[PDB]
Amino acid sequence: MSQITIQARLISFESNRQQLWKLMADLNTPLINELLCQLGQHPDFEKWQQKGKLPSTVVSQLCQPLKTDPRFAGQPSRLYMSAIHIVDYIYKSWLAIQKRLQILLTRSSSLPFPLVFETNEDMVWSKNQKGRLCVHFNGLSDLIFEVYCGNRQLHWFQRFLEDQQTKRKSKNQHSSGLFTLRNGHLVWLEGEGKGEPWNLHHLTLYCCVDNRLWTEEGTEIVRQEKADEITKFITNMKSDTQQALIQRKQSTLTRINNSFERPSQPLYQGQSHILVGVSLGLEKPATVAVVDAIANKVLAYRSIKQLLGDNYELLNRQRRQQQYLSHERHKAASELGQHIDRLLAKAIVALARTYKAGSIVLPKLGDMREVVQSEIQAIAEQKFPGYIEGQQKYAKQYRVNVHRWSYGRLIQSIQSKAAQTGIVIEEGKQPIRGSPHDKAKELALSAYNLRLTR
RNA sequence: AGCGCCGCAAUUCAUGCUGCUUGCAGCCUCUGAAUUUUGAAAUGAGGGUUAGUUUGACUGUAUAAAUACAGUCUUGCUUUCUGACCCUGGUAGCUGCUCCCUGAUGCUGCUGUCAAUAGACAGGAUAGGUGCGCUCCCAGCAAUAAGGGGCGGAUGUACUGCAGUGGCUACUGAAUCACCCCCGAUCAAGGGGGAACCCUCCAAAAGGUGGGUUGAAAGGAG
Structure with missing residues (x-):
């Protein structure tokens, strides 16, 4: 994939x-x-x-x-x-x-x-x-x-x-x-x-x-998978075209046994018990919680400011560019969001590799629009206690100042980088009305519970 | 006045340290999160200018691993920020919309000199603002049937008025540079020289030989 x-x-x-x-x-x-x-x-x-x-x-x-x-x-x-x-x-x-x-x-x-x-x-x-x-x-x-x-x-x-x-x-x-x-x-x-x-x-x-296929261990894994699939298909089957197909398959199975002169690199096998969760928000668009998932003591907290080493101004630049582009569209792109998403994916994968992480959970794209709306609502009563005009005005101002963060591109980048490294990707329910770090921690524990049940 | 954003003090916390009791007691020396402040550190800028530097690959040793070191090859694909350069346009054609007032909305606003009012002349974006931008305000203007007030020509209720506006083409050309120049190429191949810093050797020293630095990153296409 x-x-x-x-x-x-x-x-x-x-x-x-x-x-x-x-x-x-x-x-x-x-x-x-x-x-x-x-x-x-x-x-x-x-x-x-x-x-x-x-x-x-x-x-x-x-x-x-x-x-x-x-x-x-x-x-x-x-x-x-x-x-x-x-x-x-x-x-x-x-x-x-x-x-x-x-x-x-x-x-x-x-x-x-x-x-x-x-x-x-x-x-x-x-x-x-x-x-x-x-x-x-x-x-x-x-x-x-x-x-x-x-x-x-x-x-x-x-x-x-x-x-x-x-x-x-x-x-x-x-x-x-x-x-x-x-x-x-x-x-x-x-x-x-x-x-x-x-x-x-x-x-x-x-x-x-x-x-x-670049490293040796991957080439043993892929050839073992291919041989297992071929043997499973043959045993399932156990008609000139099908016959020629089965001798071709056995010939390829024999050809597979030969080894290529490829470099050998140790394979990364992250622990199953260790978990990493990422929470997608607006005030803090990406938060990371690295948890043991066995005892309720969190190994690591990470805000988005720490993730971008000497690159935090890029988020503000992208937000300004998005606001300007939205204003221009309202009248009638540098593709920086893709670069920021790839930088975030690389940073999160490096963080997971540092802590020997093997499983990371991301919120689902389809059902997180209501999560964004509820976050806007929660910060609205956070700023102003009870007068609905205040929350409405604050929500309008916060929507006009900052827009969405292109979540799907981040999901794709995280999935691609994890597949490049070999870190399992899971999904879970993002909770509502909590701190984004606590949101990521709750997501990671919920993902661990879902994996244990399923 | 209010909105977002960068960081200064102080409180709390740890995602940090002190000891191992390996989860607990204290604290802010480094690093981050939440809270009041204010205009003292940072973000911040219009259009482009490369065969752009780096983030590469393989082989071994320390390291359980990350990571570091030693040896060989090297390349120019697509991008994100930062540093430097000229400029707010010329030649010719095409095209959309049009009286006063009250509006949502939109445009303009850098410096000094000639005309108070049209336009040019030079520097240069440190382009009108609280540290900076923003559908938010500061004044002018513009347009839309969003409404009201109409008048003339026109038999006519239809139409036009009571000289401006933005967009598109071929050449021009300013960068064609990542320390900076010269030489032909930008479907292709680099060479030479020069100023600054560091290490080693010669060298009393000056200076020279050998090497490195002249920014950092990301990439699965659709």
Whole structure:
């Protein structure tokens, strides 16, 4: 469930970029547009409106005659299935957002639609004579691409090259599914300026990798899980296609037994009894309570001011920017909230790792709006005792001065960082009319009680 | 006057210390939370300017672990703050809305000089405020059928008045720099020299050789 996106820039000759632009803009983009129009006019679209799913079999069965079409004749079938995967993902996202919010539905832009790659054997690496990390995809392999990236992204490509060399050196005796690659995305970045379009817009690649494949212990865990799943499926099954499938599965099981030359790092196994709870508020948007959960003595209290080491002014800056943006919208973004959420996630994960924590609880996003409203109400009578005009005025002022804190982004960041480290994530009921530190402590004890009962 | 925010005193607490009784007694030396104060420490600023520095990876030793140290490679992807730079615009076109009063609401307000009133000339954002911003007030103005008061042309109840407003395109160009310059490149490859600090060696010393510092961070895409 955990994936990491690695970004890189692709540099090649002018003729190479010209060929790619002539191959995508004039072929793939009209492909995407025409299948979007076809599914819009497809008679089963109305039936598919009810259920938020779309199998790829029907899309392939409606798309394969375009392979031999004169306008779209020259293109690898891998790019065609990339296009159908892209349209499937886009339509699934459209169904998801329509169901969440519960025609033509076509928009346009300047950069060409991307290129996907689910399999990993097609994308092949090589070492340049200069020393760069060249990549050549399966199909049009005579055209070379140079990869450029930062210091914290080059070692993943080094591991990709090492995996390729190990695969080709051992006569393909190693497992292909054990590679760190998950997905590959080929996009552009809207290069500004004037001139030739192919020489103006940069080309970039995103590689989806798995956290549990970088270290050795993760690679033993994942191969043990895969072997257990394969054996369980075989015993469940214990028909030429199914037969060939079972020999392929046993062949992959044999391939798994071979070990990769990967670095060894000790695995983190947090204690089950130790708990960490995080409470999301407004006056104190994030509070942390590290509790033993066995005896009612709390190991650690942490307010948000201590979490951001020499970064507390960033919260005030983001609040001011949010207020200004709300005022601007009321008349008719720097994306700092994402950075603050990621900083908070890193700080909380570091705090949990310091205290040997293994379980952390977060409030649920859906039912915490009433929690925010009750916190506003509680601080309203906190400021003014009993005259309802005072509480109403204070609530209006406090709402206009400070707005929401983008809780869902924080939830996603915490989940991603915990999955990167290996800390269990739980949910619980946030209590009402209590101190935020006491709120976090009560949430942690409630989470421990729920885990004990369930 | 009131709202949020940064921190100064004092009280309490510990999420800190003193001892081990490993949860209890005391305290604020460091670090944080709650409470009255006030305008003495901090937050705070319009638009951009990089192949930007750092937060990297692997191999071992101390450490149960975090963490520190020694050896090798290195890269330019996307961002958050901070430091420095010019400026509040020019060339040509397109487009929305329009009498007085009372309004919710919105715009403006930096310094010195020529015209009291239109506009320019230079510096420069320490842009009108209690320490700073804010749908909040300080004056002017603007617009909307939010209402009232209408008048002329118009047979007409419809329409127009009683010269302004904001937005979009191609060039221009100011940064194209993280100590600062020069050289061709910004689909690509760096080199040379210079001023300041620290360590070691030569060196009575001056000075030179070898190394490091010339800011810190975050990243799963959609």
